[PDB]
């Protein structure tokens, strides 16, 4: 139904601009909020259908001490949207002392956006792992809005900032964060800024702007993940009804990104699932296997050998599933949409519950052992020490993701079966 | 002209001594029937009042003359022949057809038909034809999709009525654009596809028997120069890829000359003529017409399959009352080999 | 137009629809479509267009309408839940077969031949030939659904899994499921197991 | 079917190399590895059918201490295969220490490969005898090859580096080798490039640039080998066919070369025919007698006098096959493949099972015999002393071609019958 959009952080704050400005170019608004003569799809997902015969978009935006904010301010896309909800440390415990102390009225931002609206589905969150100003003030409001909303859903977009290696602090904040996102959120999207920026770096000459062309990717895939429920399609019009089918497990619920074309400067479906299975598409990246797979396809292609081509694919003997589980490939089609030109309009993504992640879990926990051996690199700040004297969070968020990474590998196993 | 069909009132449909005329040729009468079937598939009506002209003027003249009839018939008919092999050549693809007749029917493509041996082996034993059935088809459509071919594998099927020796190979041509190809014509192709599958299929045995370098020698000393088949293994396999290199000459004499014929000719009634000898060519060079020579060839295929189950099994050189069977092998092997070089006197 | 919005109907929007009737009352559905069984509702044809388009046509509409409201009851209540274990066990081995399931009666069938059912008439040139070509669609595609043909070989196992979504909702014993669901999902494949060409698009699993 | 290419040494990676760029002008692919539309025979015996619609080449190049592998890597043919097998001393005891030492992680580039496959029929080896790094290494991954795949077939194309005369300890590491190819292989090709040195020097004024234009020829010699693999044909389509006819022992399985045109810058099957048995053709050259011979002929000539050529070469009554058994020249017939411009398109090849070579064999025999009877030619380094004290290995591959070579006298003679 309608979904209402939280942006928090330097990073998140960003990424939701970049979206926002792609939704604006997207569908038939001004830059003013008005609805155009090029608008009929569905437009309250998003926009607020305001009074003004505006579609006015629903962005919450917080921050806490703001830079970039303030360029985003001076431009015709912060006028966009204004529904009066744009409100103006490094560290875990910081931000969360600071996001304790301010919780009040930007929670009552929250809960007059959220009886300003007809009706909720669910609220989805930018947010960027170790950003700094997100950190910390992102974990402890998300955990208020899993205490306070139990009916609706959360949603989390999070990417982690990594010039290919790194901070010091970084594993902490990490290893905490993902423990709130373990037990306060409902789905977690985790992207690598260092598979992307190699990616990116490859695809393209772009070196010193990687950062803005990743937010165009970023911005892509979110409007591709949202297009069937902005645009009259068949199913999971709903968050609820697209999240509910990959995870099997709500602690196996972080999901591994796809992205066919690698640069977008007339194919089949069959060329771009055959490609997007192999590890040159996926953008974010024992043998560690899928439990479940869902693709969405957006291109302008005739859909009746997608039936031919789960033939080839299947008899193509590529991937298996999961032991325990008669699991599926999950398949939706979309059309790309109009009024933005882009040459090569088939355009697939991935959504996937894969095993894969759990390394990668697995490689910031070893990161944040080695600090815990040492002793020289959680750096001793005074808000560290005043909120947690005895540290016992790291190690609640320890052995939380060590039965996490035990539990990834039993659920890649037929020891799903049995208990791991 | 119209191309009108019973227009016989009891004084396609075949012909009748009390519509053949014996004071006009028969070879001409066959040539009216041609001329009329064409009309309904055509160039002939925009010359068609010229052509109605003479059939006037011959209609006016009070004496009849064979030798004035006969060519007006024999060029209506030529221009009528020459309009069907204006099109079916061109825009119907005929020559790149036979292509493809060629690559599945004279196996001169192989990736399907190696393939298909290595992923079913289990008609070797008699078909229920009704589960083996499915299965051939299932697994040649399966062999078809590893590397490329989303296109064609419309017109080849397969049809099953051993399972490999009663398999068939059911195809479908364009029926208004090609009158070349009919049932019978097909059935000749199958019969020949039977016999090349059945030279393919003992060959796929030698060279899966053939180990003798692979394991039956490498790091092992073995029982060999003690216990051994004396090597009749290199023997049998050199007097069947002798025969099958000459196959090779027998099929690709024919495709040549056909290809070479169907540009010369300009009218489809001699491309019949050239294709009726290209089949009956191929037949009786391939020995496919029953002969005692063909049963002599029938005879080695026979022995070369009965070896290669016992060479199978035996990997490492042993004696296992195998020397009772072998016996036989060398004797049956002599005695149709010399019947071999008989042929040739 | 109006032979389009039938079928869009008939089976964004709907899914706030579908909601209240997830949460008979005659006026409250009246008031509802304006704005999984039982459910009178249905849309005048004026007499210009009750020429071509006929009465049992409606009904096919109506019988996979109902057969769609039944497949998202299924879906949607193993989709709004968040011996114990194997819950879990009983979640994904059922919210797979009825995600398979919706994928088949959709993509297979409603999807393709209405894609080309648009393109078909528009090819028609008379009021009269438009009911052939209309009356050439809907007694086939009611064939390829299965409402007509082996509705108790195949779908009986469908109406069966429909009794362990409500059991399930309730559970929300473990093992009286599982026995079920592996009793009558290898019936299924031993009887589709003749593949009659188009049974294949789901002879899959 | 599939058949998978290995390159080690700095001799077996060049003629690699050319070989690569040489299939890369002969078939319809770029130098980037995307299908072209001049693409349609078969591509899938020695390129992986790649999801990125590249047809990207099966070539696993591995190296010690590499010097001209890094010439290779800067170069538009070394980006035209990369599935990730790239891998980056001069005796055959040194390069066989080295080689175990390392032979784990290049196994598993080994294993990585084979199993990337949808099939498997065979692993061919680019190789020097005695090339410094490629000797001892090459024979001890060859060994490592024949043991842990023994349903797999191992084809070695082998040359011998002579400048027309000389190393001294390469008698040495010849006979180990040798040893190594009777026993771990099904399939030896080996040539002489004195022979092509001083032919190459005769049919042109190459004498500087004379290593680059052999690798012209062996590149050739190689396509022209697995034409009939390549391109749409009748007969011998995998490996093992083609190889199984020439054996009759699998110790005679060294096969001779031959080649038609002297220089390349219209004539009937007859002529070549009757060219190419005699020694003017032969490129790598009691009397010794041919036991089978092998031919290839890729020409666009008409082929039916063929079997009238049979007639004539039959009764010009020029060569006899072998006593014990009934052999006979085996003959098959190619087109010569477009998108390469050749003047005189008829090029013809022969591969011969001869036993001239056993004369060869036993010229390094004799040569080793004499370095074992001086010993002041064996160059005592400290490798050579630790991998073997006692020397007993040459011993060993002494007394194993002493027996190649009575093996191969008497199946000269009519004593095959009986045992030699």
Redesign the interface.
Known sequence: ?EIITLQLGQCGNQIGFEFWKQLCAEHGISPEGIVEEFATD?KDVFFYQADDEHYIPRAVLLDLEPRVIHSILNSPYAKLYNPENIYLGNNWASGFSQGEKIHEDIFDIIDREADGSD?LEGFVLCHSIAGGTGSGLGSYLLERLNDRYPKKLVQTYSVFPNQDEDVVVQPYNSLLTLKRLTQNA?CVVVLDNTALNRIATDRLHIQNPSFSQINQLVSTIMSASTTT?RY????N??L??LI??LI???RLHFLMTGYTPLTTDKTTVLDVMRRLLQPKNVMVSTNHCYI?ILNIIQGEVD??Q??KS?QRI?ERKLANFIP?????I??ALSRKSPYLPSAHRVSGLMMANHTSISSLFERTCRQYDKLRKREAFLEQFRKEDMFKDNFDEMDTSREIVQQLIDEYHAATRPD??S?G | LHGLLLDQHEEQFSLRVEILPSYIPVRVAEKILFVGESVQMSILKNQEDTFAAELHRLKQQPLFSLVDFEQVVDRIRSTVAEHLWKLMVEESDLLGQLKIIKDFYLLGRGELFQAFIDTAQHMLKTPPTAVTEHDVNVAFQQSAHKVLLDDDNLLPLLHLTSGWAALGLSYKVQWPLHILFTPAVLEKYNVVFKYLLSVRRVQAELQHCWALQMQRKHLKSNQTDAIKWRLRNHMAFLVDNLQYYLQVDVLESQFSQLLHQINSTRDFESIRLAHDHFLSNLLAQSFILLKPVFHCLNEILDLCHSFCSLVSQNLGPLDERGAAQLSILVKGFSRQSSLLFKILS | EYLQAMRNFFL??M??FYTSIFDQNVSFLNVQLQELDGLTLSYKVPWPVDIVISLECQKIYNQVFLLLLQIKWA??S???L?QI?RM??L???L???V??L??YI???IL??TG?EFQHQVEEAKDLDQLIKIHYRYLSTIHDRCLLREKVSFVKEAIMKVLNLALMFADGWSIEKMESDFKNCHMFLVTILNKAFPHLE?LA??
């Open positions: 139904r569905r009706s409902d429920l009259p399609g068949y199913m019009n709903d609820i009804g509910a089918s099997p497990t709500p479940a859909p009746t997608v039936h789960l299947r325990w589980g008669p699991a599926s999950q398949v799903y079966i208990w | 964004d929007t899914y706030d879906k949607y193993l989709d709004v968040l274990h879990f066990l979640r994904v081995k919210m797979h077969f995600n398979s919706h994928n959709m993509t297979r999807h393709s894609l698009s899959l699993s």
